[PDB]
Amino acid sequence: NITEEFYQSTCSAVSKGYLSALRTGWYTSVITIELSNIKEIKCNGTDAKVKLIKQELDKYKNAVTELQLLMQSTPATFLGILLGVGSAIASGVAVSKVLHLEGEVNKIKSALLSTNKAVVSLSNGVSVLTSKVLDLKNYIDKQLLPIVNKQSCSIPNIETVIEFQQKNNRLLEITREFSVNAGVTTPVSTYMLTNSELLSLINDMPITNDQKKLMSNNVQIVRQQSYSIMSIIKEEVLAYVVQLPLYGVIDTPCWKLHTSPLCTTNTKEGSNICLTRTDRGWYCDNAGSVSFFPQAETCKVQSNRVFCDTMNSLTLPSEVNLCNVDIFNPKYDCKIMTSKTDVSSSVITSLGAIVSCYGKTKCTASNKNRGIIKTFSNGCDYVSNKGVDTVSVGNTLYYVNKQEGKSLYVKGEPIINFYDPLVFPSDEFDASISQVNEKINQSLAFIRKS
Amino acid sequence: NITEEFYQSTCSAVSKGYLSALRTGWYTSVITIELSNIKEIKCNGTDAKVKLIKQELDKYKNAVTELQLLMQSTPATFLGILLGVGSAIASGVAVSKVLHLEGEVNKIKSALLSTNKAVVSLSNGVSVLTSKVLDLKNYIDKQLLPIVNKQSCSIPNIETVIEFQQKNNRLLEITREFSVNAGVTTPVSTYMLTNSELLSLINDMPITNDQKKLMSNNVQIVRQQSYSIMSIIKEEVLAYVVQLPLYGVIDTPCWKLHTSPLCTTNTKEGSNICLTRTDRGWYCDNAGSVSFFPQAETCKVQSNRVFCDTMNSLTLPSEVNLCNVDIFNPKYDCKIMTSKTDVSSSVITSLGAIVSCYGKTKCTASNKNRGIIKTFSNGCDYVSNKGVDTVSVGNTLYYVNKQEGKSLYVKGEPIINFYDPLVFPSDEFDASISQVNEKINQSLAFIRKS
Amino acid sequence: NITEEFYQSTCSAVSKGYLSALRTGWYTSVITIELSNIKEIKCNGTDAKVKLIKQELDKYKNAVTELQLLMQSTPATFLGILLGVGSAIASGVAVSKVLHLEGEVNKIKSALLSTNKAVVSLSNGVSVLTSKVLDLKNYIDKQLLPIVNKQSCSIPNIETVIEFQQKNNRLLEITREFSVNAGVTTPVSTYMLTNSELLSLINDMPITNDQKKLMSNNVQIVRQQSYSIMSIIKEEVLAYVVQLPLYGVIDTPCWKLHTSPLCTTNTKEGSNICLTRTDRGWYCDNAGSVSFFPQAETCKVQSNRVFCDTMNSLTLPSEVNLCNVDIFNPKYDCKIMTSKTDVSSSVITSLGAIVSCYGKTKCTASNKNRGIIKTFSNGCDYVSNKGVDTVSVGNTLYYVNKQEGKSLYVKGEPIINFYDPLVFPSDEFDASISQVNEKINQSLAFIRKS
Ligand SMILES: *[C@@H]1O[C@H](CO)[C@@H](O)[C@H](O)[C@H]1NC(C)=O
Ligand SMILES: *[C@@H]1O[C@H](CO)[C@@H](O)[C@H](O)[C@H]1NC(C)=O
Ligand SMILES: *[C@@H]1O[C@H](CO)[C@@H](O)[C@H](O)[C@H]1NC(C)=O
Ligand SMILES: *[C@@H]1O[C@H](CO)[C@@H](O)[C@H](O)[C@H]1NC(C)=O
Ligand SMILES: *[C@@H]1O[C@H](CO)[C@@H](O)[C@H](O)[C@H]1NC(C)=O
Ligand SMILES: *[C@@H]1O[C@H](CO)[C@@H](O)[C@H](O)[C@H]1NC(C)=O
């Protein structure tokens, strides 16, 4: 149920019909692995099945020593320039710091003695979920101790050698990811947290039923917005913090704004003036205001659900939406940029394509079964994605999205015609309708002086 | 056969001698894996060789269930601001959408019954290559059914346990990549498509012999420009779309433009004016025009072959090349920027290094066996890579490329001297030679008024 | 021992107390793997243990052929616009090129005959460390030749089949990484160089004892700043160059500068003027000057040690530090930007948070156990991280860093009040205090004309 409207007057289009899924907070969980403390590998036997077990214990001990070197380092990692600067893992690292305090590990270790999942209140008072995901201590001590603890080693069966390599592999891969990521990984792989464990962790979290359903049906998105932070390894326990997203805003209207340069079409080369709406990005109603996301990557779309991160957003009054139907409205000052760079390009929207065609550029739209069906004249135009498969601007061939949905072409005079090119400011990168008007007055006043 | 020319007048250099390899389209292929439908693991025997087989089937079924959660989400993912906005996987996703239609899977499944490679015309009419790369259904049903389908399970040999883990591993790794990439991966790994399968897929594609030779000798580049899109999993078939690049433009001349700030060298601190050519990047002749690639990553160089993506390009008239030999030419308006920020830096070209040395900065060029061999005075200068191994600008040490090739130093008066610093605009980021001239006239006219 | 100072006058904060770890050069080492030359797999026996060995040799030969296709391609890969352009792997590639010369491999192969580590002087004269990390030739020829070299193949034990898959796996993973990275990988994984081999390689390098201690305690950072460059594969030897960082500057003072927009707080909407210090980033004393790193990613912090890369830096006079205590100082011209965009945001510093609150925005600071404890008025303010856990600006919730350290609030009149909004330039992106003053004079002079 996605719709789109193109505004010929402002060379821009809005895609409506989306639902919000904004990350507004973080939930920190502590994931543990019970380790076996092995120092000496006591066996002088040259048996082939013992040698393969000795070689896997060396890999095991190498990973332990490798992780111990990571815990000794406190781990870390148009209108985009207007944002702030957050600290993404500031919450998770804070939990990682507490686990270094004395006895804090013993709290975790004792709570995870009978069950593999428990809720622990730390010394500072925060209630974190704790999960023991692997008990290599139990396996090594019950299945491998009678082998490599005496001098007359008992030769294991071939099946145990294979089984130990499987169980040890997860530890090795967790160590591998932390080694090439300085102890902070994102997204969180299935080695840090399996699809079963993650879903189970979501169900046990203190969140609403709407958040549980949302997170469970989009765990791949949950992983891309999660961090895995190596913390400690001591007292036979490896602990790393998993920082999961909290979606405080769900199911509010979202819309995406696409913009393209709007220039004059005079045949004289340098006598053209351009103008581009700069407020392009994702917009989502949020607590009476509008959360605006100017960057491309910060929002991921899954069907009609938009997952965004508020740390890369601005908070604007809802009147910002008035710029779509009336860019000259007196309630909000719509942001634009100006130039004399009349160069051709295209923007692929959710349900169509905007084409800014200028100069000697060949701009067309094609179908697979029939070829060219529309040829654009100079200016800014738009074509729906129904019956159109590709758009061509110069030597560039853009495929359009085949998402189903109705588009609407809103006819209107391109607002660039309302300006006189002799008093038009054309070097404005962070400007607005009013900043241009007041700047034209100053130029127009100095002309009135003559 | 790479050459380079440095232009002292404009503080810029051009590297010629390259050949084009531009991605201009996409080819979509459907890769399938025949799966076995296993529900109940019927065996109450505690045999060690059966237990290892049961543990691998659980991993198998976990990957199947994990993939089923991915298919329920329609998957997605100086002069750089001038480009447009494409939708990279719009073509592949379109094919991924068709595979959800009724019976479309049965078409694929039936065509891949006798052979593992076939050409299928879908319901919409497009002809796509289809490849069955793994038949776990055949392996599980022929090698594993007589084990875990009765209640008196037949204990397999140890060799089958090892063989099943190998064949199941590819499915697990494909699932792993799609889990941490929201169903869209790039580059395409050897798990999605092995070097043998990819080469075979290229040879069977409906393309020219030049494209086949080009793609086969640079498959590592082909992978970096390809996408793997998870599609469907039903009726015992896992299908994912692989989106491969089409190189419509091959073997045309390409050249790379390097630019650096050109400032005045007055000893008074703030009395200096700067000027930098902004049209830097890769240029490739293309269909009578020139494809310009302003960003760094969009083009990858392999020997003398330049692989670029047209979606991140502009289409300029061929006269843009005139800016190199004459920046004041009357046919094309060469783009520049201005500032008063006289700060030192260097640009490592293909066959040398440009040095913009200003103020109290120590700028040198060194050889490993002899140390400093040249000391730069203030201004913009250039040194060939023959006999030079490193360049130093301040506290920064740049190694130069040791690619073989002749360089040419084109003497000329730095054009920054032709301007008077009192009417010089110094806040222009998107400007040109003519925009500066007409702006100097307006400032010069208001001075004539006095 | 980290401290922080906030400057209310300039809406900026400086975090002191850090120690430098600047990458200033590169060390190139050659890592080799002795390969076995296998062509024909002579065995017509259908034994299950032979079949598993034949299947692993095919994977082995596939990786060899895959690597041979990579070596045939010479491999490659606010104030940020002011930097230069280096060539990161120019040093490593230079070594990779020399290994293609005749007999250069024989030098390496002969030197690594008795030991697995040797120092080799190449034909050009450079002394590089060389390390043989895997001898598959020795394993295949001693453990696998009596099997697949006769026609009456001798069936191996099951333990050898498992052992061969382990030793062959490293070669396969090295091949895997080079396939999806065009022969150049970063960071350097434990497959290219294990934690034991890397530490051993560091200890044998011709560097100081301070560099050895620094590199060994932060090998995860060493990996993130290293490259692995596929070179050659011929004469039964696979060789790839590992490019390691050299830290020429260690333990000098470093400090991080945070800045935020400073605007006027008039209730009239568009009558406000803004101003933002643009010199934000990392600063480290370096050889009498100051190395300035304007970008975020180029510096990684581990406790109080800052690892930076000089290739992404500028070299400024030490007087740049005067802008913190006096932005109007006459020795250095402090860089700023101007706008009329009064929009709310926050910057999370090392020990607190700057809040730029304007208009109808709700800006607060909270504690977990008590909720809101401070409400910001319009303007630019600051709050320490002691007793504060989160900051909220609009719909955005920022967690603050809980690093221990003292903060200091330096009271002062916001310098934006000293300007008259009628002659204030508000479109300056690359400007400074003096450029603004001289621009106000020109506007003020034309007003004096009337
Ligand atoms: C569009 O949306 C409404 C509510 O989502 C739904 O009831 C309606 O059926 C949808 N239209 C179509 C054609 O399905
Ligand atoms: C400023 O410009 C606006 C629109 O361009 C106009 O309505 C207004 O009268 C001007 N003001 C002055 C003082 O010229
Ligand atoms: C330079 O190029 C031409 C054509 O590529 C070739 O014939 C010529 O031999 C090359 N020069 C050298 C020195 O090899
Ligand atoms: C504008 O400037 C150009 C070059 O600076 C000059 O040739 C031309 O005569 C000027 N035009 C006017 C009207 O001053
Ligand atoms: C702060 O630093 C100095 C030197 O690093 C150290 O001697 C002092 O003890 C530190 N302060 C505290 C409270 O530890
Ligand atoms: C320029 O401005 C500065 C400060 O704004 C002032 O001290 C100086 O006198 C001015 N110069 C002229 C010529 O007006």
Residues 62-121 of A with CB under 8 A from B: 78
Q: How many angstroms separate the CA atoms of B416 and B10, rounded? A: 8
From the CB of B55, is ligand 4 less than 6 Å away? no
Residue among C256, C265, C420, C429 nearest C344 (CA): C265
Cis peptide before B146 (omega within 30 of 0): no
Whether residue C203 lies within 8 A of chain B, CB to CB, comes out as no
Q: How many angstroms separate the CA atoms of B338 and B277, rounded? A: 9
Residues of chain A with C-beta less than 8 angstroms from the C-beta of C189? 176, 179-180
Say whether C180 and B224 touch across the interface (CB within 8 A). yes
- Mutational pocket test of ligand 6: of C441, C442, C446, the residue with most ligand atoms within 8 Å of the beta carbon: C441
Token couple for A426: 């054309």
Q: How many angstroms separate the CA atoms of C426 and C424, rounded? A: 6
Q: How many angstroms separate the CA atoms of B237 and B31, rounded? A: 10
User: For the sheet containing C345-348, what is the strand order?
Assistant: C345-348, C352-357, C379-384
Those residues whose C-beta lies under 8 Å from the C-beta of residue A221, and which sit 6 or more positions away, are A21, A300, A302, A307, B182
From the CB of B203, is ligand 4 less than 6 Å away? no
The bound ligand whose nearest atom lies closest to the alpha carbon of C2 is: 5
CB atoms within 10 A of CB B382: 25
Using CB atoms within 10 Å of the CB of residue B261, give its burial: 0 to 12 exposed, 13 to 18 middle, 19+ buried.
buried
3-state secondary structure of A303: coil
Contact A44, A216 (CB under 8 A): no
Q: How many angstroms separate the CA atoms of A215 and A205, rounded? A: 11
CB atoms within 10 A of CB A149: 15
The bound ligand whose nearest atom lies closest to the alpha carbon of A446 is: 2
Say whether A398 and B84 touch across the interface (CB within 8 A). yes
Chain-centre distance for alpha carbon A432 = 29
Please report, as a single letter, which amino acid is at residue C85.
Answer: V
Residue among A335, A199, A189 nearest A257 (CA): A335
Q: What is the CA radius of gyration of chain A?
A: 30
Best interface-test mutation with A: which of B57, B73, B173, B437 has the largest number of A CBs within 10 A? Answer: B73
Contact C262, C11 (CB under 8 A): yes
Residues of chain C with C-beta less than 8 angstroms from the C-beta of A287? 395
Report phi then psi at B284, rounded to 5. -140, 125
Q: What is residue B377's DSSP assignment? A: P
Q: How many angstroms separate the CA atoms of B294 and B279, rounded? A: 7
Give the sign of the dihedral formed by CA B89, CA B91, CA B95, CA B100: positive
**Torsion of Cα atoms, A222 then A227 then A233 then A237, to 10°:** -10
Token couple for B448: 């004539």
CB atoms within 10 A of CB A118: 18
Q: How many angstroms separate the CA atoms of C34 and C134, rounded? A: 6
Token couple for C144: 């696998």
Say whether B76 and A301 touch across the interface (CB within 8 A). yes
3-state secondary structure of C198: helix
Best interface-test mutation with A: which of B165, B180, B247, B442 has the largest number of A CBs within 10 A? Answer: B180
C-alpha distance from C125 to closest chain A C-alpha (Å): 33
Q: How many angstroms separate the CA atoms of B52 and A163, rounded? A: 7
Residues of chain A with C-beta less than 8 angstroms from the C-beta of B26? 399
Q: Which segments of B80-159 are extended strands (E)? A: 117-121, 127-135
3-state SS string for C315-357: EEEHHHHHHHHCCCCCCCCCEEEEECCCCCEEEECCCEEEEEE
Contact A288, A55 (CB under 8 A): no
Q: How many angstroms separate the CA atoms of C98 and C231, rounded? A: 9
Best interface-test mutation with B: which of C46, C71, C73 has the largest number of B CBs within 10 A? Answer: C73
Domain ranges of chain B: 2-21+253-448, 26-246
Please report, as a single letter, which amino acid is at residue A180.
Answer: V
Whether residue A399 lies within 8 A of chain B, CB to CB, comes out as yes
Whether residue A288 lies within 8 A of chain C, CB to CB, comes out as no
Give the sign of the dihedral formed by CA C32, CA C38, CA C39, CA C44: negative
Q: How many angstroms separate the CA atoms of C219 and C225, rounded? A: 10
Whether residue A17 lies within 8 A of chain B, CB to CB, comes out as no
Half-sphere exposure for B351 (CA within 13 Å, toward CB): 25
From the CB of B423, is ligand 4 less than 6 Å away? no
Contact C75, C227 (CB under 8 A): no
Those residues whose C-beta lies under 8 Å from the C-beta of residue C6, and which sit 6 or more positions away, are C12, C13, C349, C352, C354, C382, C407, C408, C409, C410
**Bridge partners of residue C324, in order along the sequence:** none
Those residues whose C-beta lies under 8 Å from the C-beta of residue A418, and which sit 6 or more positions away, are none
Pairing state of beta strands B289-293 and C431-432?
A: unpaired
Q: How far is the CA of C441 from the centre of ligand 6 (A)?
A: 6
From the CB of A440, is ligand 2 less than 6 Å away? yes
Plot region of B334 (φ>0 → left; ψ -120 to 50 → alpha; else → beta): beta
Whether residue A268 lies within 8 A of chain B, CB to CB, comes out as no
Q: How far is the CA of C439 from the centre of ligand 6 (A)?
A: 9
Whether residue C245 lies within 8 A of chain B, CB to CB, comes out as no
Say whether C315 and B78 touch across the interface (CB within 8 A). no
Residue closest via CA to ligand 2's atom 5 equals: A437
CB atoms within 10 A of CB A248: 17
Residue closest via CA to ligand 2's atom 12 equals: A441
Report phi then psi at B369, rounded to 5. -85, -5
Token couple for C371: 């909720």
Q: How many angstroms separate the CA atoms of A309 and A224, rounded? A: 11
CA max distance for chain A = 108
Q: How many angstroms separate the CA atoms of C93 and A233, rounded? A: 39
Q: What angle do CA B439, A413, A80 make, to 5 degrees?
A: 60
Instruction: Find the closest chain C residue to A429 by CA distance.
Output: C427
In order of A339, B115, B369, C272, the CA distances from C424 in angstroms are: 22, 75, 56, 10
Ligand 4 atom closest to the CA of B444, numbered from 1: 14
Token couple for B116: 């593992």
What is the residue-wise DSSP string for B281-299?
A: EEEEEETTEEEEE-SSTTE
3-state secondary structure of C260: coil
Q: How far is the CA of C16 from the centre of ligand 5 (A)?
A: 14
Size of interface A-B (CB pairs under 8 A): 154
Say whether C55 and B166 touch across the interface (CB within 8 A). yes
After which residues does a break in chain B occur, C–N more than 2.5 Å?
77
Q: How many angstroms separate the CA atoms of C184 and A383, rounded? A: 42
Report phi then psi at A404, rounded to 5. -80, 135
With DSSP H G I counted as helix, E B as strand and the rest as coil, what are the percentages for chain A, rounded to 5? 30, 35, 40
Those residues whose C-beta lies under 8 Å from the C-beta of residue C38, and which sit 6 or more positions away, are C57, C60, C61, C140
Q: What is residue B228's DSSP assignment? A: E
Resolution in A: 2.8
Pairing state of beta strands B390-393 and B363-367?
A: antiparallel
Token couple for A217: 């049906």
Q: How far is the CA of B3 from the centre of ligand 3 (A)?
A: 11
Total length of chain C: 450
Contact A165, A56 (CB under 8 A): yes
> What b/e string do you get for A255-276 counting C-beta neighbours within 10 Å, with b at 16 or more?
bbbbbbbbbbbeeeeeebbbbb
From the CB of A437, is ligand 2 less than 6 Å away? yes
**Torsion of Cα atoms, B442 then B443 then B446 then B448, to 10°:** -100
Size of interface A-C (CB pairs under 8 A): 154
Contact B346, B391 (CB under 8 A): yes
Those residues whose C-beta lies under 8 Å from the C-beta of residue A13, and which sit 6 or more positions away, are A4, A5, A6, A7, A257, A258, A347, A349, A352, A354, A382
**Bridge partners of residue A79, in order along the sequence:** none
**Bridge partners of residue A284, in order along the sequence:** A254, A291
Token couple for B315: 């289409």
